Structures are given as structure tokens and as C-alpha cells.
Enzyme design. Structure first.
Site, PDB file in Angstrom:
ATOM      1  N   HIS A 160       4.971  11.344  -6.009  1.00 14.90           N
ATOM      2  CA  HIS A 160       3.821  10.934  -6.799  1.00 14.90           C
ATOM      3  C   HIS A 160       3.596   9.436  -6.778  1.00 14.90           C
ATOM      4  O   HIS A 160       4.456   8.672  -6.341  1.00 14.90           O
ATOM      5  CB  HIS A 160       3.994  11.400  -8.254  1.00 14.90           C
ATOM      6  CG  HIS A 160       5.265  10.933  -8.897  1.00 14.90           C
ATOM      7  ND1 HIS A 160       6.399  11.712  -8.958  1.00 14.90           N
ATOM      8  CD2 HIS A 160       5.568   9.780  -9.542  1.00 14.90           C
ATOM      9  CE1 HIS A 160       7.353  11.053  -9.592  1.00 14.90           C
ATOM     10  NE2 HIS A 160       6.872   9.878  -9.956  1.00 14.90           N
ATOM     11  N   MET A 204      10.687  16.112 -19.506  1.00  9.15           N
ATOM     12  CA  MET A 204      10.602  14.765 -20.069  1.00  9.15           C
ATOM     13  C   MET A 204       9.339  14.556 -20.899  1.00  9.15           C
ATOM     14  O   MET A 204       8.225  14.555 -20.379  1.00  9.15           O
ATOM     15  CB  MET A 204      10.686  13.707 -18.969  1.00  9.15           C
ATOM     16  CG  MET A 204      11.992  13.745 -18.189  1.00  9.15           C
ATOM     17  SD  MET A 204      11.973  12.631 -16.779  1.00  9.15           S
ATOM     18  CE  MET A 204      12.037  11.046 -17.607  1.00  9.15           C
ATOM     19  N   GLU A 256       1.580  10.321 -12.001  1.00  7.42           N
ATOM     20  CA  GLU A 256       2.283  10.202 -13.265  1.00  7.42           C
ATOM     21  C   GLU A 256       1.566   9.250 -14.206  1.00  7.42           C
ATOM     22  O   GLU A 256       1.012   8.239 -13.782  1.00  7.42           O
ATOM     23  CB  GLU A 256       3.721   9.726 -13.058  1.00  7.42           C
ATOM     24  CG  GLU A 256       4.637  10.087 -14.215  1.00  7.42           C
ATOM     25  CD  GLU A 256       6.053   9.593 -14.014  1.00  7.42           C
ATOM     26  OE1 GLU A 256       6.992  10.393 -14.203  1.00  7.42           O
ATOM     27  OE2 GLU A 256       6.225   8.402 -13.668  1.00  7.42           O
ATOM     28  N   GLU A 286      -4.316   3.526  -0.332  1.00 12.74           N
ATOM     29  CA  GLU A 286      -5.106   3.790   0.865  1.00 12.74           C
ATOM     30  C   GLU A 286      -5.358   5.280   1.021  1.00 12.74           C
ATOM     31  O   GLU A 286      -4.422   6.054   1.220  1.00 12.74           O
ATOM     32  CB  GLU A 286      -4.402   3.259   2.110  1.00 12.74           C
ATOM     33  CG  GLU A 286      -5.087   3.656   3.405  1.00 12.74           C
ATOM     34  CD  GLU A 286      -4.285   3.275   4.634  1.00 12.74           C
ATOM     35  OE1 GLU A 286      -3.111   2.885   4.480  1.00 12.74           O
ATOM     36  OE2 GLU A 286      -4.829   3.367   5.754  1.00 12.74           O
ATOM     37  N   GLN A 331       0.777  -1.232   0.000  1.00 13.63           N
ATOM     38  CA  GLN A 331       0.000   0.000   0.000  1.00 13.63           C
ATOM     39  C   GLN A 331       0.811   1.285   0.000  1.00 13.63           C
ATOM     40  O   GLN A 331       1.942   1.341   0.482  1.00 13.63           O
ATOM     41  CB  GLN A 331      -0.922   0.019   1.215  1.00 13.63           C
ATOM     42  CG  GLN A 331      -0.167  -0.163   2.509  1.00 13.63           C
ATOM     43  CD  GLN A 331      -1.029   0.039   3.725  1.00 13.63           C
ATOM     44  OE1 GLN A 331      -1.984  -0.699   3.954  1.00 13.63           O
ATOM     45  NE2 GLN A 331      -0.687   1.039   4.525  1.00 13.63           N
TER      46      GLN A 331
END
Ligand SMILES: C#Cc1cccc(N(O)C(=O)CC[C@H](NC(=O)CC[C@H](N)C(=O)O)C(=O)NCC(=O)O)c1
Ligand SMILES: C#Cc1cccc(N(O)C(=O)CC[C@H](NC(=O)CC[C@H](N)C(=O)O)C(=O)NCC(=O)O)c1
Ligand SMILES: [Zn+2]
Ligand SMILES: [Zn+2]
EC number: 4.4.1.5
Lengths: 172, 174
Positions: free
Chosen positions: B119, B150, B165, B92, B26
């Protein structure tokens, strides 16, 4: 107030077909010192380093760790990359170069002001035997299994102070 | 400078036998408003709500979401719990009661001072088609696929402003 079950599940839609192949691939944490972090996550927690990515122009490195057999890791760089980023449940550690040499620098674990992120969590066969080993290895604890409110789960910290939960899925 | 491969690889130990069957189960995030969050993660991102846990004495709820088939979720509470917490790569969401009604309250995403967490990342078959749908659904972006440094990966925001992402493992960025 808190949501009723019925309200909560009413906010849940079935997945759109276009999302059916989506997978939760990574969690990213910034790390001050990868020497300390890599030792912790491999030796203490038993993760495997899948891949190291360096970006000299941008002055940072990325370390992807996961619970994977190392023998499954492709040797070729391009094949390795495609394999790493297709794994579930990887941990991405981000190293901004120089932080380890800067004594004024440290990252924030999200459990004090300002709060947000809380922790990553590891499922283990036995929380108590796991934490006994952790204790012997000198690991720092936020919450030993039988302290605090919820019994049978633990919080330890990595070298940056991020909380890592230790839990047994069959005893909850 | 940054570590050499040699230094980095030397700091890695082989897993101790006692760590066998350990799994990364998690990632926990605190959420201001579970109505918006559940809608976002299920409808926009296609995750499934595995289980809801309430703790009235402490006034908070926990929402565990994952990319799992709804039909694999055990009906029995005890069997559901053991199943949920044995899944890899769950999310979670922690809801402290009352936060949704407090206009002064908001959580910090870790991408500004003080930084830490960055992230979660979703692997997708096609970043561009995924982000086109996201745009169409009114999703807020930090970084559209071809912007920033990027190219070919994107950052979107959840209702709390956490970065998510969007990446394609067969079409690596830049
Ligand atoms: C086993 C097990 C099990 C069962 C239910 C939930 C969880 N996990 O994964 C938790 O994170 C709950 C942790 C809990 N989470 C919260 O309390 C979240 C609410 C809190 N106010 C916050 O904002 O962090 C906590 O930090 N408790 C500490 C303790 O018992 O001493 C694990
Ligand atoms: C596909 C793919 C792919 C390839 C390599 C890496 C990644 N991931 O998961 C990243 O996190 C890179 C993100 C990157 N991460 C960093 O730059 C890390 C260092 C940064 N200073 C920090 O502290 O976050 C970033 O924020 N760039 C956004 C942009 O392109 O403008 C994905
Ligand atoms: Zn990432
Ligand atoms: Zn948790």
C-alpha cells in the site's frame, strides 16, 4: 486512445480544505529477509533506518527507512514513533516472520503477470556515476542507463527483486 | 521469531557520501482508467497533478501527483519537468492505452497471492473525520478505522483496488 492534456486536467479538482494537511507518508513492500533488505537500502542506496516495530502476537515486523539524518531521530520510543509517521516519503518494509527460512517463498514485484505495482524511484545527482558504483557493488540491473527505450534512467533490483528506478530530475 | 534489534541495527550501514542528496521521489502504480484515478487522487485524497507525460509510440501515459501547491508548478515544460521529478513523495500512475475498454483486464494490488507491494499511506490529522468524508463521497473501504486487527488506522481502495492506508501520526493504531 490516451487522454488529451485538457481531458486529464479537467478530471483534476482543487484539494478540499479538509485534505490540505494530508501527506504521502509511506510506500509499503513485503520483504523476505530484512537482513538482506536493510543492508541493501542503507549501504547501496543510502537510506536511514528510522524505526523498527515488532508485533509478536501477529508475527511480523515493520522497518521504516527514509532519507533522513539519523541525528534527527528521537530516542524515546513514543516520540520516535510520532516523528517517523510524520515524515514524508518513507519506505515501509514488512517482514512476515519465517519467510527468510522458507525456500519455497518469494514475493512478487508486480512487473510480470499479474502486474500492478511497478517500482519506487530515486532521484540522484548523476545516474551514470550512480550506476557505475552500483555495478562495482554487484547490484543486479533490470535496465542499465543506455539500454532499453528511455535513455538516462536505470532500473535496479533490491534483494526481493523489486524494481528501483534511478533518475536525474534535471535531465528528462 | 523475527530479528532482534541488535541483529537488525547491525545490518544497517551509514550512508555512503555518494548517496548524498538521494531522495525517494516516486512510487509507480499501473492504472486501468486515468479518468477515475485522477478524480480519486485529486478530489477524494487532495493530491495535485504535477505533470502529464505521453508516449504515443509505446501507447502509454504517465501521471505524476503529489501534495504540492498548484501555483508552485512551473509553466515552462523543461522547468516543470525538473521541478516535478525533484519533489519528494510523488505518485506516478501509469496508463497503458486501451485497458479502460477491456472488461477482462484488471491490475493486481499485491495483497493477495502472489503478494508483494502492500500500500501507500496517507498521514492525516484525524482518521475518523477523514474516513467519514470518504464514506460520504462513496469511497470503497478495505478496513474501516475500528475494524480488523489494528484500530485507528484505515484502508481504502483506489479505482484499481490498490490499498491506501489512512493514519494519524499523533494517534498511533492499537
Ligand atoms: C528520467 C526519467 C523519467 C521520465 C519519465 C518517466 C520516468 N519514470 O519514472 C518512469 O517510470 C518511466 C519508465 C518507463 N515506464 C513505462 O514504460 C510504463 C509503461 C509500461 N508498459 C508498463 O506497463 O510498465 C519504463 O519502464 N521504461 C523502460 C525503458 O525505457 O526501457 C522517468
Ligand atoms: C498509524 C499507524 C500505523 C502503525 C503501525 C503500522 C502502520 N502501518 O503503516 C501498517 O502498515 C500496519 C498495517 C498492517 N500491516 C500488517 O499487518 C503487516 C503484515 C501482513 N501480514 C502483511 O503481509 O501485510 C495491516 O495490514 N493491518 C490491518 C488491520 O489492522 O487489520 C501504521
Ligand atoms: Zn503501512
Ligand atoms: Zn517511474
Amino acid at each position: 486512445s490516451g487522454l488529451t492534456d485538457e481531458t486529464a486536467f479537467s478530471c483534476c479538482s482543487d484539494p478540499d480544505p479538509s485534505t490540505k494537511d494530508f501527506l504521502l507518508q509511506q510506500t509499503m513492500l513485503r520483504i523476505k529477509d530484512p537482513k538482506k533488505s536493510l543492508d541493501f537500502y542503507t549501504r547501496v542506496l543510502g537510506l536511514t533506518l528510522l524505526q523498527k516495530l515488532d508485533f509478536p502476537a501477529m508475527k511480523f515486523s515493520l522497518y521504516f527507512l527514509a532519507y533522513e539524518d539519523k541525528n534527527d531521530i528521537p530516542k524515546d520510543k513514543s516520540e520516535k514513533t510520532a516523528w517517523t509517521f510524520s515524515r514524508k516519503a518513507t519506505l515501509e518494509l514488512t517482514h512476515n516472520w519465517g519467510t527468510e527460512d522458507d525456500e519455497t517463498q518469494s514475493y512478487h514485484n508486480g512487473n510480470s503477470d499479474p502486474r500492478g505495482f511497478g517500482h519506487i524511484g530515486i532521484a540522484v545527482p548523476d545516474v551514470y556515476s550512480a550506476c557505475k558504483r552500483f555495478e562495482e557493488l554487484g547490484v543486479k540491473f533490470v535496465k542499465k542507463p543506455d539500454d532499453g527505450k528511455m535513455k538516462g534512467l536505470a532500473f535496479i533490483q533490491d534483494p526481493d527483486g523489486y524494481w528501483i528506478e534511478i533518475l536525474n530530475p534535471n535531465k528528462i
